[PDB]
Scaffold this active site. Structure first.
Site, PDB file in Angstrom:
ATOM      1  CG  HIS A  41      -0.511   0.218   2.507  1.00 26.46           C
ATOM      2  ND1 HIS A  41      -0.346  -0.830   3.385  1.00 26.46           N
ATOM      3  CD2 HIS A  41      -0.131   1.329   3.175  1.00 26.46           C
ATOM      4  CE1 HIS A  41       0.085  -0.365   4.548  1.00 26.46           C
ATOM      5  NE2 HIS A  41       0.224   0.946   4.444  1.00 26.46           N
ATOM      6  N   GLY A 143       2.851   5.715   9.582  1.00 28.45           N
ATOM      7  CA  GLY A 143       4.211   5.604   9.072  1.00 28.45           C
ATOM      8  C   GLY A 143       4.967   4.386   9.553  1.00 28.45           C
ATOM      9  CB  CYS A 145       3.032   0.205   7.089  1.00 33.74           C
ATOM     10  SG  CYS A 145       1.406   0.109   7.889  1.00 33.74           S
TER      11      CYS A 145
HETATM   12  C1  LIG Z   1       0.979   1.810   8.110  1.00 32.68           C
HETATM   13  N1  LIG Z   1       1.815   2.722   8.015  1.00 32.68           N
HETATM   14  C2  LIG Z   1      -0.351   2.082   8.814  1.00 32.68           C
HETATM   15  C3  LIG Z   1      -0.203   1.610  10.291  1.00 32.68           C
HETATM   16  C4  LIG Z   1      -1.494   1.999  11.095  1.00 32.68           C
HETATM   17  C5  LIG Z   1      -1.677   3.519  11.189  1.00 32.68           C
HETATM   18  C6  LIG Z   1      -2.221   3.775  12.633  1.00 32.68           C
HETATM   19  N2  LIG Z   1      -1.754   2.629  13.423  1.00 32.68           N
HETATM   20  C7  LIG Z   1      -1.318   1.544  12.483  1.00 32.68           C
HETATM   21  O1  LIG Z   1      -0.895   0.492  12.863  1.00 32.68           O
HETATM   22  N3  LIG Z   1      -1.358   1.267   8.169  1.00 32.68           N
HETATM   23  C8  LIG Z   1      -2.595   1.848   7.682  1.00 32.68           C
HETATM   24  O2  LIG Z   1      -2.795   3.038   7.816  1.00 32.68           O
HETATM   25  C9  LIG Z   1      -3.569   0.880   6.992  1.00 32.68           C
HETATM   26  C10 LIG Z   1      -3.441   1.046   5.472  1.00 32.68           C
HETATM   27  C11 LIG Z   1      -4.400   0.100   4.749  1.00 32.68           C
HETATM   28  C12 LIG Z   1      -4.239   0.233   3.206  1.00 32.68           C
HETATM   29  C13 LIG Z   1      -4.333  -1.350   5.299  1.00 32.68           C
HETATM   30  N4  LIG Z   1      -4.907   1.282   7.391  1.00 32.68           N
HETATM   31  C14 LIG Z   1      -5.324   0.991   8.729  1.00 32.68           C
HETATM   32  O3  LIG Z   1      -4.620   0.390   9.478  1.00 32.68           O
HETATM   33  C15 LIG Z   1      -6.745   1.462   9.096  1.00 32.68           C
HETATM   34  N5  LIG Z   1      -7.387   0.372   9.765  1.00 32.68           N
HETATM   35  S1  LIG Z   1      -8.542  -0.560   8.941  1.00 32.68           S
HETATM   36  C16 LIG Z   1      -7.658  -1.627   7.777  1.00 32.68           C
HETATM   37  O4  LIG Z   1      -9.354   0.409   8.133  1.00 32.68           O
HETATM   38  O5  LIG Z   1      -9.392  -1.192   9.933  1.00 32.68           O
HETATM   39  C17 LIG Z   1      -6.724   2.717   9.972  1.00 32.68           C
HETATM   40  C18 LIG Z   1      -5.924   3.830   9.325  1.00 32.68           C
HETATM   41  C19 LIG Z   1      -8.217   3.108  10.166  1.00 32.68           C
HETATM   42  C20 LIG Z   1      -6.120   2.414  11.336  1.00 32.68           C
END
Ligand SMILES: *C(=N)[C@H](C[C@@H]1CCNC1=O)NC(=O)[C@H](CC(C)C)NC(=O)[C@@H](NS(C)(=O)=O)C(C)(C)C
Ligand SMILES: *C(=N)[C@H](C[C@@H]1CCNC1=O)NC(=O)[C@H](CC(C)C)NC(=O)[C@@H](NS(C)(=O)=O)C(C)(C)C
Lengths: 305, 305
Positions: A41, A143, A145
């Site tokens: 992503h 940030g 990930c």
């Molecule tokens: C990666 N950098 C980030 C890590 C998250 C950000 C906040 N705490 C974390 O662990 N990952 C994301 O932002 C992912 C991205 C998608 C494409 C998988 N999105 C989420 O984790 C999302 N949760 S979800 C999949 O919608 O239930 C958030 C942003 C709502 C936490």
């Protein structure tokens, strides 16, 4: 003596962390030999995140669109490919700090260390367990990930986790290094829920042995139990069934302390039925399930890497 | 989101760890530039340990009696000297992995990471607090002495602790890197007791702010208190007095959450007088005092090194 939640030394993994930026998004990548592994992503914008078509987004990207930095040094990307939920960016320079390593897919109940990173730089290291519901209880921000989880065996780093997302309860989900998610999760911003979790029984027993080794013995009772009768109690308190394999894995701690596993099961059964009555074990007022038998042996016997 | 006991990344310190052997005893040493720092009791035998005269034992040792190994490589010792409770072995090779560093003497209530090592090799990393009684609650076995504690600020490693001994309660004691003990302890095998410990109030407050940041808000009440009245309660529960300096240090978390420090004090006062009634805060059934305000900000804001 003493017992702490202890992480693996992180230096071998620190030398592999890089920053990957595509457009406006920057995450972390893992640089091993001449390949950088990162979450797919990185190629999304905000609008793309509700329901991205990753194969479509990647078709429209070329090698030069990927800005990879290792410290203050740009690494030139010379190929790219997608494997499940991870991108593999071939770079023109092999990482001279690449450790001996393996990619492993760990089982629920196993532990690992996470090196939490932002912009390719480490911020901290902590130990985690793969929960029975395929989530981890981590600490991750925007940030983070591409931060990875790992074990070390002598000189070999076994990478087992790459961080992708946070789920409604404050819990975390990710992939192995082949990009396959642990659990029934997808890399998209939609409503996803983890299954109900359960307590990792073999690990609680391991920690009770750690307590005995440290001299915290008040909870040992005079009884034994059968494996079947213990499991009937475990069930009601949301504990995983204890198997004969788990009993065998507890063999080294059982032999060291001279307490049979089924005798420790009787002591745990009493704790579950009666509580701790305001007492602590190894300083904790709740029973702890994020130490494996191996973690206990490694910490109490001083295993090094 | 999430909150874990998080240690600093250990790679910078891993590249400084060496093994020091004198006669039959082997401990760890810290190799910075062309000097190896280690506990002076590496020069003792078992008989020497009840009441050693270190100056006498060192007079009878020459450079070549010190076997220093960095990995599989012997480092040749070319000078030796004692500073308080540490030995300084000058070697003929500067460590090429020496980070930018400082030697600091930390104050009670401050935290650091420990890299626990045996035979010069790391086994694990964990976070610790210098307790008000000048002990730490670590996890250390035979052969762990010379393991160090540290903080990192950007690229600079601040070494603050070197491990020397274990005290009757399973707690640990050591020196700064100038060899002066924290606390009223001596490096000899005789009966020594730590003073009564106390709870680090400013840190409990910091962790309550961490809980608010994570959405665990059930304990916030509608009241405020004066600093004097809070301290009268703190006293009875064996908590350190809260000072205006501590109130100022909590300023960034107070500003971020919009909860005044004295309002959080009122909420803590209620927890102390009434208990948690079987509830948890950030997963813990006891109030936690080993996170400083800075640790909370660093973890919740993603500070990297
Ligand atoms: C990666 N950098 C980030 C890590 C998250 C950000 C906040 N705490 C974390 O662990 N990952 C994301 O932002 C992912 C991205 C998608 C494409 C998988 N999105 C989420 O984790 C999302 N949760 S979800 C999949 O919608 O239930 C958030 C942003 C709502 C936490
Ligand atoms: C250093 N390698 C070792 C670390 C101890 C060993 C067990 N757990 C530890 O943390 N340090 C010692 O063995 C020191 C040596 C003296 C010269 C200071 N001795 C002790 O820690 C001693 N405790 S004491 C000072 O007598 O109360 C033990 C061995 C009884 C624990």
């Amino acid at each position: 003596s003493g017992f702490r939640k202890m992480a693996f030394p992180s230096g071998k993994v620190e030398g592999c962390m890089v920053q990957v930026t595509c457009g406006t998004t920057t995450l972390n990548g893992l640089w091993l030999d001449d390949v950088v592994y990162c979450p797919r992503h990185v190629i999304c914008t905000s609008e793309d995140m509700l329901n991205p078509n990753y194969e479509d987004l990647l078709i429209r990207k070329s090698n030069h669109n990927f800005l990879v930095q290792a410290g203050n040094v740009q690494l030139r990307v010379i190929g790219h490919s997608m494997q499940n939920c991870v991108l593999k960016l071939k770079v023109d320079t092999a990482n001279p700090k690449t450790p001996k390593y393996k990619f492993v897919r760990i089982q629920p109940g196993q532990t690992f260390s996470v090196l939490a990173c932002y912009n390719g730089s480490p911020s901290g290291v902590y130990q985690c367990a793969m929960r029975p519901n395929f989530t981890i209880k981590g600490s991750f921000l925007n940030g983070s990930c591409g931060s990875v989880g790992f074990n070390i065996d002598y000189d070999c780093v076994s990478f087992c986790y790459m961080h992708h997302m946070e789920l409604p309860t404050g819990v975390h989900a990710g992939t192995d290094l082949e990009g396959n998610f642990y659990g029934p999760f997808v890399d998209r911003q939609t409503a996803q829920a983890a299954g109900t979790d359960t307590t990792i029984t073999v690990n609680v027993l391991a920690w009770l042995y750690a307590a005995v080794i440290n001299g915290d013995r008040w909870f040992l009772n005079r009884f034994t139990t059968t494996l079947n009768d213990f499991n009937l109690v475990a069930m009601k308190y949301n504990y995983e069934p204890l198997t004969q394999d788990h009993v065998d894995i507890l063999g080294p701690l059982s032999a060291q302390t001279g307490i049979a596993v089924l005798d420790m099961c009787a002591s745990l059964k009493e704790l579950l039925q009666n509580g701790m009555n305001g007492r602590t074990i190894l300083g904790s007022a709740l029973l702890e399930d994020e130490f494996t038998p191996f973690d206990v042996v490694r910490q109490c016997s001083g295993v090094t890497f």
